Design a protein around this ligand. Structure first.
Ligand SMILES: NS(=O)(=O)c1cccc2c1c([N+](=O)[O-])cc1[nH]c(=O)c(=O)[nH]c12
Ligand SMILES: NS(=O)(=O)c1cccc2c1c([N+](=O)[O-])cc1[nH]c(=O)c(=O)[nH]c12
Lengths: 197, 96, 138, 118, 141
């Protein structure tokens, strides 16, 4: 309330507009707080790789003595050159000796380490218990896994045509769904909690 | 005054959150609702026509159920129907 | 190839899409790709086009830059370099392509002709902003 | 002199485009695009001279179901007209039987295009 | 005489593989792929393992290939069906198929969690600029 209210038209104008302002602002605060408490939205700090290069709070490294490090080393794109500079001038060693070591380093920390790896194993792990990881952004390189054969074997053309036929009809996608998403532990609402001190 | 304002606004907002969420709640009413969600486990008799019906199903929803079925509940399946009824009664809505 | 891929699909989601597909849009389908782009631009978000990712990116980087690519790639295919059967330019060409890919040449050309020549740019908080309550201050 | 190898392509931005003031330049110098520089690098590594052109049909390879004849750059290849094709040729089973491709230089897929939210 | 590697989910030993004898204990993606490949080609296969590196590579001094590549070069196997990466050095000594699975480098992070509420999280509903404008509007009024 007030122990005094203005009696002149000018002071009363000031008070009225202040009152309108107060009403709107308090209503907006309460409404947006209700929104916040009703809908949980967790934003990933990263949605790309440039975001990862600009950030310095988050650390990232590859597997030491591998093809990924060899890719970053000989790169010509600006972003990956910056990442290589960071990884070469990083203390302690962002690099790692095994894939499981990188996974464990990511899991033990809390949003501090980001691991650069292959899309397939990342997608697989994003479906493993504990389901405490996810893949972000697109892909920074193009590669393929291919069936091999000795030079001169009569099996080259048939296997090429077999994989092409399977891809065209859609077998390989089904198998990937079967062994990555299906046969996957966690697929893809919680009551609201009372406010805490 | 500042403290009072913050506290009363927080009370009203969190109460609105409570009631809104309690109003969103759509219970299970069909096979699809059970299929998509996973907070509740569902399993049928170990040996019977239901297991065969799901296994040999060409439908999308029951195919998804079967994909979920045989998972690590550890054991969604059961041996006796009375066992299933007792398991559902004991579970606090966590089994169907 | 997209219509055939959806029609001949054994996947659940694309099966559902095909079930929806061929419906009474009247015509979700189109005859020309430019037609699809124009239709999406005219529609106020009421149409979504399915097309090769490369063209989606190129268009996204074209003026007026009023469209975007969303999601991963439903399928997975590739573009290749063709030589006639029994030619002397088979091994050398494949080796050259692979060497270029490892050296990063192809990715650099991709970036150059998709982004370093795009009319558009290169690349959060639900808290109420001052733009929402500007009239109050005015 | 090692014979110039005839290269087939197609007009599809940005893979192959006509440079500004086409009449000013003649030959390969009038063409600008991703595939042009790719062909340059490939011929540099192989070590052969090339002359570009364009498929008159302006369509990618495909066979007539009854006539059993290819209509497009695949035709210009398997009929001896062309020695190599440097263009966005999708890799397929039908073509891989009558043509020798290379490992994909660009992986690709179907994707979703929407109106940019203003 | 196909070849494979235990890297999951491509090759793995089925639960209770002691009961299974051979070519049926294994499970995964590469195994189903080899099954379909043999079906479309006809030949019969016996899944095997190599170890000794688990993948292809070369020792610059020994100049001897190791792993699946090493055994394919030296006749110890017919074909290799596995997540074997296409690369220049390998294509010079063996022959690949068109990729059955395309991939690339990507970024793994820990899933963002419900952040522990911060002191002065009661200001979050409004942006800082609104709060400062409020202060100075109070002063001005
Ligand atoms: N031919 S390969 O190139 O031998 C190779 C083949 C297949 C999977 C690999 C892999 C390599 N590597 O680089 O060594 C590392 C790696 N790391 C992971 O974390 C994972 O899941 N899979 C892999
Ligand atoms: N050999 S191909 O496979 O013939 C083919 C090759 C290269 C580009 C294609 C294309 C096809 N297609 O399927 O018809 C459709 C299409 N549509 C677009 O919108 C675009 O930008 N590029 C294309």
């Amino acid at each position: 309330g007030c122990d005094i209210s203005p009696r002149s038209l000018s002071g009363r104008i000031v008070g009225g507009v202040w009152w309108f302002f107060t009403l709107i602002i308090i209503s907006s605060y309460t409404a947006n707080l209700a929104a916040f408490l009703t809908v949980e939205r967790m934003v990933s700090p990263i949605e790309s790789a440039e975001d990862l290069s600009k950030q310095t709070e988050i650390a990232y490294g590859t597997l030491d003595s591998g093809s990924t490090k060899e890719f970053f080393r000989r790169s010509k794109i600006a972003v990956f050159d910056k990442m290589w500079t960071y990884m070469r001038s990083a203390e302690p060693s962002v690099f790692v000796r095994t894939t499981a070591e990188g996974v464990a380093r990511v899991r033990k920390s809390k949003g501090k380490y980001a691991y650069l790896l292959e899309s397939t194993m990342n997608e697989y792990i994003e479906q493993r218990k504990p389901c405490d990881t996810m893949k972000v952004g697109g892909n920074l390189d193009s590669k393929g896994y291919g069936i091999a054969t000795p030079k001169g074997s009569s099996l080259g053309t048939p296997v090429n045509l077999a994989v092409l036929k399977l891809s065209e009809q859609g077998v390989l996608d089904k198998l990937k769904n079967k062994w990555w998403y299906d046969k996957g532990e966690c697929g893809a609402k919680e009551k609201t909690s009372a406010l805490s001190l | 005054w500042f403290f009072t304002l913050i506290i009363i606004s927080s009370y009203t907002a969190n109460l609105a959150a409570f009631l809104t969420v309690e109003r969103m709640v759509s219970p299970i009413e069909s096979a699809e609702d059970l299929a998509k969600q996973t907070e509740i486990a569902y399993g049928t008799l170990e040996a019977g026509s239901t297991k065969e019906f799901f296994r040999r199903s060409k439908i999308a929803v029951f195919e998804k159920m079967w994909t979920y079925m045989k998972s690590a509940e550890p054991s969604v399946f059961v041996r006796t129907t009375e066992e299933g009824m007792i398991r559902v009664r004991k579970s606090k809505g966590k089994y169907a | 190839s997209t219509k055939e891929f959806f029609r001949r699909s054994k996947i659940a989601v694309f099966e559902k899409m095909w079930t929806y597909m061929k419906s009474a849009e009247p015509s979700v389908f189109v005859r020309t790709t430019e037609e699809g782009m124009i239709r999406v631009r005219k529609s106020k978000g009421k149409y979504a086009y399915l097309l090769e990712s490369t063209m989606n990116e190129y268009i996204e980087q074209r003026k007026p830059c009023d469209t975007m690519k969303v999601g991963g790639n439903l399928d997975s295919k590739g573009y290749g370099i063709a030589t006639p059967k029994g030619s002397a330019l088979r091994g050398p060409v494949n080796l050259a392509v692979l060497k270029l890919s490892e050296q990063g040449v192809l990715d650099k050309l991709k970036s150059k002709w998709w982004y370093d020549k795009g009319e558009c740019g290169s690349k959060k908080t639900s808290a109420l902003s001052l733009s929402n309550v500007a009239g109050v201050f005015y | 002199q090692n014979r110039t190898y005839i290269v087939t392509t197609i007009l599809e931005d940005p893979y192959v485009m006509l440079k500004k003031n086409a009449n000013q330049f003649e030959g390969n110098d009038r063409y600008e695009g991703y595939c042009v520089e790719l062909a340059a690098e490939i011929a540099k590594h192989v070590g052969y001279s090339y002359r570009l052109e364009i498929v008159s049909d302006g369509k990618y390879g495909a066979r007539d179901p009854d006539t059993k004849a290819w209509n497009g750059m695949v035709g210009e290849l398997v009929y001896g007209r062309a020695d190599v094709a440097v263009a966005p040729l999708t890799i397929t089973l039908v073509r891989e039987e009558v043509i020798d491709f290379s490992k994909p230089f660009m992986s690709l897929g179907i994707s979703i295009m929407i109106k940019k939210p203003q | 005489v196909v070849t494979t590697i235990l890297e999951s989910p491509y090759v793995m030993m089925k639960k209770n593989h002691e009961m299974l004898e051979g070519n049926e204990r294994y499970e995964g993606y590469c195994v189903d792929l080899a099954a379909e490949i043999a079906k479309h080609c006809g030949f019969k296969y016996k899944l095997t393992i190599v170890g000794d590196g688990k993948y292809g590579a070369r020792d610059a001094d020994t100049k001897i290939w190791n792993g699946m590549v090493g055994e394919l070069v030296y006749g110890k196997a017919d074909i290799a069906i596995a997540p074997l990466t296409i690369t220049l050095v390998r294509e010079e000594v063996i022959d690949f198929s068109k990729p059955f699975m395309s991939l690339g480098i990507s970024i793994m992070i820990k899933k963002p969690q419900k952040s522990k509420p911060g002191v002065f999280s009661f200001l979050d509903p409004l942006a800082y600029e609104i709060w400062m404008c409020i202060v100075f509007a109070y002063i001005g009024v």
